[PDB]
Structure formats: C-alpha cells, structure tokens
Design a protein around this ligand. Sequence first.
Ligand SMILES: Cc1cc2nc3c(=O)[nH]c(=O)nc-3n(C[C@H](O)[C@H](O)[C@H](O)COP(=O)(O)O)c2cc1C
Ligand code: SF4
Ligand code: SF4
Ligand code: SF4
Ligand code: FES
Ligand code: FES
Ligand SMILES: [K+]
Lengths: 45, 432, 263, 214
Amino acid sequence: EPFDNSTYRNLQHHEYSTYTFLDLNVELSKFRMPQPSSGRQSPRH
Amino acid sequence: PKKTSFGSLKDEDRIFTNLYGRHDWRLKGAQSRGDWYKTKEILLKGPDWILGEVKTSGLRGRGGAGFPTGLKWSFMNKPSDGRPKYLVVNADEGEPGTCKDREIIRHDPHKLVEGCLVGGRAMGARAAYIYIRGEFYNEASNLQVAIREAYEAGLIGKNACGSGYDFDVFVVRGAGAYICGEETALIESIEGKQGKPRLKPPFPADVGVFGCPTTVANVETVAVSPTICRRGGAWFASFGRERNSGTKLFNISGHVNHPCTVEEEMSVPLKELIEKHAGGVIGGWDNLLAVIPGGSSTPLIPKSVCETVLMDFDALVQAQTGLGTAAVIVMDRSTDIVKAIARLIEFYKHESCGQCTPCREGVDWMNKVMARFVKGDARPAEIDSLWEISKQIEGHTICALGDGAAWPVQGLIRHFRPELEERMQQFALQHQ
Amino acid sequence: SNLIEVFVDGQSVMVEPGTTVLQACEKVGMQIPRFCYHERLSVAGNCRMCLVEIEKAPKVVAACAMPVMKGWNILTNSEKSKKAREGVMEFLLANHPLDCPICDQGGECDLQDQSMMFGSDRSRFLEGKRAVEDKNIGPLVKTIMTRCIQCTRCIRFASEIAGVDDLGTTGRGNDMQVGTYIEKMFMSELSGNIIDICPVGALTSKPYAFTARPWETRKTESIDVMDAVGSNIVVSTRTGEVMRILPRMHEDINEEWISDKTR
Amino acid sequence: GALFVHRDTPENNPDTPFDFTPENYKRIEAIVKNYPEGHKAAAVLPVLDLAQRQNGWLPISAMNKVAEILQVPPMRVYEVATFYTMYNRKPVGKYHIQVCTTTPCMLRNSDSILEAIQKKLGIKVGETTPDKLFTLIEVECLGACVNAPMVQINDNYYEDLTPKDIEEIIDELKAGKIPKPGPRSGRFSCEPAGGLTSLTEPPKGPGFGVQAGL
Ligand SMILES: Cc1cc2nc3c(=O)[nH]c(=O)nc-3n(C[C@H](O)[C@H](O)[C@H](O)COP(=O)(O)O)c2cc1C
Ligand code: SF4
Ligand code: SF4
Ligand code: SF4
Ligand code: FES
Ligand code: FES
Ligand SMILES: [K+]
C-alpha cells in the first residue's frame, strides 16, 4: 500500500514458459470481433 | 511566460511513471497510476477532438523520423470505402542504443493498450496490431497479459470502455529482423512475407497492411496519447521548445557511470542528461570522445559540439546529426571510434534486407572499406571515395536503412578524418 | 478528357492518371534506364536504375513506380539523374563477375549496354567480389547465379505469368540469392521465357550455350507451327544454320512469350 | 556457414517426420483467426515459430507442413525461414546462447563475456557443445543497451554480465535448473545503479491533471 519503489514488481516473466504467449493468444480468441473478409479465401483463389 | 532551459522535469509531469517496474504493471496498479481514466469520455469526444489535441500538443514521432503525430494520424480521417482500417503499433525496437520501447511494453503495458484504443478511435480503426520484436518474448507475454485484463474488464473489444466503439488489440511477434522496424517492412512482416519495405507513393494511410488504410506508430508515440488527451495537449506543449515539444524517454548507454533509461523534458542539454541522470561519463566530461545522440543511425558529434547541444529535433539537426530515437551512446577517450563506427556499419550490413541495389551492395561495400580503416590498410584517397559511396547510397534506396547506414560513416569522416589518416600512415610505416 | 499535363524536359504531354514517370517519358520517345522493371510484370522498384529528378524536388524518384503529378517536370538528363544512374551502376558492377567473354549474354546484355550508356567507364571497387553457387532448375535454363543482379524479374514472371511459385529469394542483404531453396526443377510450358527477361547472363539457354554471339546472327521473323496459336517468333541463323528461336512481340497473339516447345 | 540453399540429409528431408501436436494445432487455430479472411498467409511467421518451439528447429518437413496448413506455396515459407534470423534451419543446442556484440554493448566489454563463454564451454562461436547443451552465436542489438553486456539464452535476457556471472549462469544451466533472468548486478531493470535520478515519489492518483470533462 505505501510507496514501494525499493522493490521490483515484474517478477512474473521469471515463470513464463515456451507456450505462454501462444496460450495467452488462445485464451484471447474468446473475446475478439469477427474478422473482416476480402470476399475470397486467398489471393490465389 | 517562456522557458529558456528545458530540463529538470518533475515526477508529476512524467508520463511513464512506472518506468522501472517498481509498481504494479497490471490493471489494478495501472488504474491507480491514472491509466484507463475517463477513456469513455475521450472516445466520445470524437476522433476530431482527439486528433485536435494531438496536434495541439505538437507531438512528433518518437521512433526516429519525428514526423508530427497529429498531422500523420489525420490521414485516416477520410471516410471508409468498405475496407477496414487498422492502427499498427511499432514495437520492433531494433535501433542500437535504443531500449525505451522495451520498458513501456513490460512496465506500463496498459499505457500502450489504452493509447492503442485512443489512437485507433482517432484514426477510426477497428483493430490494433502491435508488432513486437521476437526477442522480447517476456515483454510480449506481459503485454498480452495486460491485453487480457483490458478485455476482461471491458476496456477493449465489444463496447470498448462503454463508448460503443469496437476495438481489438493483436500482438504479432517478429522473428529477428531490424528492418522490420521500418513501417512498411513491418506491414509486410505482419502479412507473412520477408520484411522488405515497400515503395512509398502508395502510402500506408491508403494501402497498408492487408491493403487497408493503416497508420504505423511508435510505442511511445501511441502510449503518450492518453495522457495527451486527458491532460490537455497544451500541457504537453508547455515542455521543450517549439516544433519539438513535450518530453522524451532517453536511453543513455556506452561509457557512462550509470547507464540508464530516464524520462527528461525535451530540449534538455545533453550535458544535463549525462551528468544528472547518467552520472556522467567515466573519467569526467573531459574524458568524452564523441557521443552518438539518437541511436546508431544518427551521426556522431565530437565533444566540442556535444558541449552545448540541446536534445531535440531542431537543435540536433543544427548539429549535422539527428535526434532519432533519443538513444545516446557516449564514448570516452579510451575508445577506438573507427572500430565503433565499423561495428555499426557491420550491424547495418547484417540487417540490410537486400531488396534494393544501393543498400544491398553499397552497405556491404562500406563495411568492407571500414573494416580496412580499423587496420589502417588503406590510402587517404579512399576517405573521399567512402564519402562519395555513402552519398550514392543516401537518397537512392527504398527505405531509410541505407540513409541510416550512410550517416554514421559521414559523421565519422566529418569529425575524425585525422584519426583515420593517422591510422593509415601508421599502417604504411609498419608495412613497407 | 481526364488527362493531366506533365512535362518531360519542359515538353508537355497529356497522360492518363496513374501513369508513372517512366511511361510519361516513354511517350516522348525517351527510354528510362531500368533492370527490374518490366511492363508486363508487376512493379518491383528495387534495382533503382530508373531514379530520375523531378524539377524542384530534392529527392530522386523511381520512374518505374512513381505516378506522375500535375505540373511535374521530369529531368531525365539532369546531373542529379546521371549521378544516380552512375552510382546504381557502380553498385551493380561492384560484385558482378568478370565473365563477359565467357558469358552468353555478352553483346546483347543490358548490363553491358547500360554500363556503356549511363554508368562510369572505370572501377573504384578495391575488394573481393561475391560468389554464389549455381542452381539446377532443369535442362533448359542454365543458372550461373553469381551473375544475378537480383532484379526479381524471373520470380515475378514465374509467379504471375507462369503461375508457378517456385522461384524466390533466400537470405537477405548482400548474400540474398534467387532460386528454389530446395533442389527442384523449374518445369513449365513457359519456363524458357525467364531467359529473355533476365537482363544478365544469370539465366541462359542450355541448348544455345557457347554456340553463337548476338552480332553475327541473322534474324528472320516468322511464325511458330508447334501449335495453333501462331506465336510470332524470330529465327536466329548464322552461316546457313538455325541457331535458336526467340519470341517476337505480338500483343494480340503471344505478347513477348513463346512456349518451351516453340523455343 | 549459414547456407541459404537446402540439401537433403538422412535427417533433414521432406520425409523427415514432423507434425503438430493437437495442442499446437489448437494454438495455430487461435493464431489464424487473428487476421481477416482471405489473408491467412499473415500467419506464416507465428506458425513457423510454433513449429520451432515444438521441434526445437525447422527441418524442411516443418516448412512444408506450415505451407500445407496455410495453403501458401512452400517457396513462400522458405523465404520467411531464410530471411528471419531467429529461425533455426539447423539443430541448435538445448540452450541457445546469444551474445550481443554491437557497439553499445561492445563499449561495455561484451568481448570479456564472449571469451568467458568460449572458455567455459570449450567451444567457439557458431558451434554446439558435444553434449548438445549450448550453442553460442554473436547477435546484433537485443534492445537492452542500457544494461551492460547482455546475452539471450533461449527466451530470457541475462544482463550486465561480468566475466564471472555468465560462468555461474552456465554452471546452473548444466545443473538443469533455470536461472533468474535480468540484470545480475544490484539494479532491477534499467534504473541508474547509484539510485533513482527519476521517479521517487508516490505516483499521482487517477484523474490528476485533467481538463474540463476529457
Ligand atoms: C531501419 C529502420 C528501423 C526502424 N525501427 C523502428 C523501430 O524499431 N521502432 C519504431 O517505432 N520506428 C522504427 N522506425 C521508424 C518507422 O519506419 C516509422 O517512421 C515510425 O515507426 C512511425 O511512427 P512514429 O512517427 O510515431 O515514429 C524504423 C525505421 C527504419 C528505416
Ligand atoms: S534500403 Fe536496404 S533494407 Fe531498405 S529496402 Fe533497400 S535493401 Fe532493403
Ligand atoms: S551478364 Fe553482361 S555484364 Fe555480366 S558477364 Fe555477362 S555479358 Fe558481362
Ligand atoms: S536470375 Fe536474372 S531475372 Fe532472376 S533476379 Fe537474377 S538477374 Fe533478375
Ligand atoms: S526500374 Fe524502377 S527501380 Fe528498377
Ligand atoms: S547494444 Fe547490445 S543490446 Fe543493444
Ligand atoms: K538472360
């Protein structure tokens, strides 16, 4: 609660893994808007 | 009335108050530090008011070029022709000497997220794409944790902040390329190709990522905006000189007692920065050899110039250098400056995307020539050739990497030709 | 009636909007130097040989990719335009192999001709040159890839005209190489057309190799009978012997392409 | 070496067994939906990175698998593989030591860290230890210039190393345990080592310098 500029507060990334970012993306897919569409499926279509 | 010495910024007027990660970087901590405050009102004021305040602040690009932010962001004010519009936050941070973006994305990530919201609303964009360098894995994961909290709190996504605006923030990691800091090379790296910059006459505001109207903005440019809109714009303009306005993050590295990242008022003397924040150059200010003021692209200045220079775009342009990214790399007198500039040119040779002839061939040529200059294995009639080759690369490439490679060479040749010729003469004496 | 007015060395021309600087110069009979640009391919803008000065504009522009603006005066022969060309040609020739006597392109190169017409007459490159290993893409195209100037014409042609995405670039910087990465044949009915579009001897015809020089051949213009398209061709002969077959432009039939059977 | 032409080996060939685990396919699915329909070639870089994070490196079979999954030509995936330096087109060690050797780190004696690493590992720059535990390369700027010479082992940043701290890091690396990343000196992230010449007061609460109704 008091001023604590005598300690680091970014110790979470010490416990990150190989799949932390991609798991976060997976859990983020929940709340996104539907993507726009260019009509086709690929420029080669 | 007016200011004449633009330094000694107080804690109150510092935007990035969690710069050292000594407070909570998550949503709970960020909110108590003023973040995400009345963002609904800022969005409801409309894009015109947000852009008007960004123009009032006089804010310029914090990722190099320094183009005015309000004018650049207003290229998206046009109506929609059906295509989506995106804000693309540049988080590549590949410039040697520069580590300021890294510090926002992990200690004030909510600043970046809410700046994405405010700007994208100002440009009328549906989503933000934060392109972080792949080497910043922990910072990217911290940013995505912040994005997840912003989503779960309703600040991003459907009915963002209660404004009715729908906004998304996607992080897309790079894969080890410094050229992907360049805005169009970054765009094409988002699209899954090689990070090769595009020819400019089609501008990103017309044809950007996925061929849609986009604005590419630096992390700091985006992140200051919520404080710009929430604090007044006039308040931001009351810092630094005219044109170059506000405050900047400074990276002081090199031959310095305390290399550090600090937020200092713009137009600060380089001396005040180095002595007050960085603790001075090792051995004192007498032991100063060059200083590179704005990251590896900005040419060096000698101790004489650096004695009474101010840290802003105009003052440093007067000194034949640039402000760049405000990444000062100081060198004491125990430094082989030819070796340092050759190392920088080697970096630029390793980072050239190879697309266009001048960068691809000439930066490699200049690396070969500069490697000889370290040994002295050259004649003094090659210095003028190196200058002419650098001018042949400058202004003839697709992107500004060629320019940012030619400029360190020119800044070395301009202020340290006697050292180059002394090395060449010593080599001629040793090898008969 | 929506034509805009631009100037090429002060001479006024009326061009459709979206016309590039190169095209506006083309309609006064001035051919801007170029390597990567091909009118039938997409615009790349990488060789930088087409750089030209716009009057009152401090920075040169790529004529092949830059759309003209109203009131622009193209200075195709100003000193800044010549120096841009000389610098670009110097960079192109810095690592280029000294293969002109042994390279089949010699005498009809483009690098040679534009070095003579737009570049300097001497070298100040005092270093060792680049060398890349050869690629085998079939028995039709000999790829002496250390002659490649990375104009991407072959890649653009293969992707757009031929529809096969086999050609590409690997690496970056000075060691960026044009090829297939993997060992793979460039098989296509239109494969042999990357030989003609290649400005240099990087891509050459294997059957034609070492056999004739461009100046000694007699060029007879005729029609292909290997199919019912009737592609317009040029038959190169020398001392009473057919030497090779080249495409002959016909916008209505074959453009500037022929099939591999025709070639 | 770092050659940009592939040659088939009994280990690196199209028939080299590679496929994504179901969890990785779910992650790919989450990655693909981040881009508009008709523009899913924008996922080549992160899907390739996932292939590397699962397998450890990129055999040509992984490149072909990514190309198949995104229906992009394999050559397009080859270009991305050979352009971005974080893609291992050859196997690397368990710990990929990446020492920054460009000028701001060089001025802080990055060579005294490189020599300590080359002495402890008994290996040179650009090669792996026989136990396939450490690969050592020299990298360009890693965006940590404020911190004295730093390395990146795999995903972590170890900063302001002395020729002794990197020895300890490698010592606990060989002992299996992962070391705490960041500055190995007394400082925490990027602040001045002698003390905070900057923010040292309670930060202002929400709504401090506001105007009108924002
Ligand atoms: C080689 C090169 C690298 C760049 N790297 C970065 C970078 O890492 N971060 C950044 O913000 N801008 C970078 N830029 C500048 C961008 O191209 C662009 O001008 C800028 O991001 C626009 O946003 P701003 O006006 O807010 O700076 C780079 C430019 C070049 C030529
Ligand atoms: S200047 Fe260099 S990095 Fe930029 S497009 Fe040209 S070759 Fe690529
Ligand atoms: S491609 Fe042209 S310049 Fe190069 S060796 Fe052949 S003839 Fe000479
Ligand atoms: S092989 Fe020929 S056509 Fe292809 S990029 Fe090289 S020079 Fe251009
Ligand atoms: S012809 Fe315009 S750049 Fe190659
Ligand atoms: S200089 Fe080594 S991290 Fe940027
Ligand atoms: K050819």
